[PDB]
Each structure stands twice: as C-alpha cells, then as structure tokens.
C-alpha cells in the first residue's frame, strides 16, 4: 500500500548456494514479493507479478530454477527484451500491475532501500539524487512502483557518466503481456 | 539485531516520541527540557538545542537505525502514532498539514516528536502539535526537515 517500506532477510550461505545450484533441489520455504537470487558468477533480483516470477536475461540466461520438486524449466523467454520468467514459487506473494499511470516511481534495491525516481520515457526515468554506480549493482530485476504500491517495471540498466549513476533504464509492464504470446 | 528508527520515550511527567535522522535522535523541547538521555554508561548530554524551533537532539542510542530525509517533494504525508497507526495527511504550507480524516484529540496525544513520512518511506518533519476546534483535531503543525539540517550546523 502506502507508504512503501521494505526489509531484507538472508536465507542461504555460499557453500549452500553452490550445492543447491548443482542438485537443483531447493527445500527452503518461500516468502515475499521480491526474491534475491544468485548464480555462480552473478547475483541479482527476481519479482513476482500475477502468478509469474520474472527476472533479467542478462542474469538468468536460459537456466532452470531450483524448486523443492527439482529443477523447473522457464515458462517465458524473450532475449530481445532482456526478460525471463518461471511459475512463481509456492509461498511467494504476487504483485499487481499499475493502473494509476502516475509518473512518480519508486525503485527497490537489494539492500531494501527505496529510491525515488521520476519518469521520462517508456523505458527511462531519472534519479532525484545521484549515487555511485557500485551502490546500484546487483539490484537488476528489482521492481519500480507507483505510490499505490503497484508494478510499473523492472530495473534493467543504469545511466552513468564517470562512475556516478544519473538515470535508469527499465522494462515496462506492457512488455510482460507482449511476451506472453 | 532488529533495529528501530522511532523511540518511545518517557520522563516523570509526560511521555512522547523520538525519531532518529542522520546520526541524531530527535524530539520536541516542550516534552524534553534540557534533560540528558539515559545510557548504561550513565547520562548523555544533548548535542543540539533550539528553543525557537521546539527542537532537541542527542547522539543516536543503541538499537537504532536512521531515516533519510525526503527527496520527492511530494505533499502526501503519513503520520505515525505511538501505537504504530498510520494517518494520511495533506501538506498546505511549510509547517501546516491537514488531516484527511479528522479525529478526537485524545487519539493523537503522546505522539509528538514522531515522524511525518512521504510515500517513499522517507522523512519530512516531526509532529509539533495538533490544531483543534472544540476538541476535534483537524490539522497539524510539524517541524520541517530543512530545520534539523540547519540546526546540525
């Protein structure tokens, strides 16, 4: 709802992730809308909207997702849009698309910081106060919300000029629908 | 290891709210005086005093994490009560803000010093006092954040 506030919890260690990655069997229980996921090289974010768990292809590639019934093959894929999705895991909670069409958006980081962002285009939007690029790293696939708490898009890439981030490039909610055919 | 931005505090006579912003635990002069805060290494003297502003600050205690100042300029606030209820509020002037749902005066009492938060969860002011017409609180006064910054220097 409003106001937006977030908090972060860690569930798995380093040795744990590696072993799980291979075996492809994950038995931990699930909660929340955004999940912190990780591979071997990278570690980023994935967001549940409307029964589907979505993330960035520059992170997930073509991989399956470790569930308690073994590995689970992707439902949708769209390389050209940098998007991917699986069925949302048991115990997750889904978001609902925006309708207000409001232009004041809010980015959620992997540290559970809520950053104010002002819309420009359909894929772009500007930071209200600049941050170093290192800070925004690892938060790809995190949701951007309207003030009512609804999904507007997903953080894809950042605009920087000398190691300082100025704006953000994101995947809009319409491009989910698109990809589901 | 679970930490809070907002402290429920007490003296002998009254009982109110404190809110940690930018390394400082903040509150109102009309609840505090020039009192020290209690720590297990004994008493701790105030860092910033401002009679004109109804403002007081100590160094932030143990088991506290700070809020960040609002950046969005939004005028659609949300006040937090000492029972942790959320009241929607609409900003008029620099320190004025009108309730969206007017309330009995009993219900806002003891919740001074508490925060007024923008939609992003960021911080905008601290609740100074309630405006009442025949016992029914209709708007609120608050200390803006730009003050707690100019006070800091």
């Amino acid at each position: 709802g409003a106001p937006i506030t977030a908090y972060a919890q860690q569930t798995r260690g380093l040795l744990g992730c590696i072993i799980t990655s291979l075996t492809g069997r994950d038995k931990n229980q699930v909660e929340g809308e955004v999940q912190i996921v990780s591979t071997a090289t990278q570690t980023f974010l994935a967001t549940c909207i409307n029964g589907v768990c979505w993330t960035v292809y520059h992170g997930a590639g073509t991989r399956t997702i470790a569930s308690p019934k073994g590995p689970v093959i992707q439902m949708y894929t769209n390389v050209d849009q940098d998007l991917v999705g699986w069925p949302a895991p048991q115990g997750s909670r889904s978001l609902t698309p925006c309708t207000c069409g409001s232009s004041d958006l809010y980015l959620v980081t992997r540290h559970a910081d809520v950053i104010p962002v002002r819309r420009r285009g359909d894929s772009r939007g500007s930071l209200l106060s600049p941050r170093p690029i290192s800070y925004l790293k690892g938060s790809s696939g995190g949701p951007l919300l309207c003030p009512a708490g609804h999904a507007v898009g997903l953080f894809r890439a950042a605009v920087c000029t000398r190691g300082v981030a100025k704006a953000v490039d994101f995947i809009p909610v319409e491009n989910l629908e698109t990809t589901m055919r | 290891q679970v930490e809070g931005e907002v402290q429920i505090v007490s003296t002998a006579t009254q009982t109110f709210l404190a809110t940690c912003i930018n390394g400082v635990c903040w509150t109102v002069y009309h609840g505090a005086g020039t009192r020290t805060i209690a720590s297990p290494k004994g008493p701790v003297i105030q860092m910033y005093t401002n009679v004109d502003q109804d403002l007081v600050g100590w160094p932030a205690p143990q088991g506290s994490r700070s809020l960040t100042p609002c950046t969005c300029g939004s005028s659609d606030l949300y006040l937090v009560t000492r029972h942790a209820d959320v009241i929607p509020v609409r900003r008029r002037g620099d320190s004025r803000g009108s309730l969206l749902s007017p309330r009995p005066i009993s219900y806002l009492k003891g919740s001074s010093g508490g925060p007024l938060l923008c939609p992003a969860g960021h911080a905008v002011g601290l609740f100074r006092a309630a405006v009442c017409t025949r016992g029914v609180a209709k708007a609120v006064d608050f200390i803006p954040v730009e003050n707690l910054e100019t006070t800091m220097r």
Partner: peptide, 21 residues
C-alpha cells in the same frame, strides 16, 4: 550450466509495528 538459486527475500507487505521484548 547450473541452476538459479534463491538466497534471500525482500518483503514489501510489512507494516510498522512495536518491536516485542
């Protein structure tokens, strides 16, 4: 090529409340 693994969560649906002792 391995599998994607969940290692944490971020919860939006949390609302302010008084930390119990």
């Amino acid at each position: 090529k391995g599998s994607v693994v969940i290692v944490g969560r971020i919860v939006l649906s949390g609302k302010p409340a008084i930390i119990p002792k």
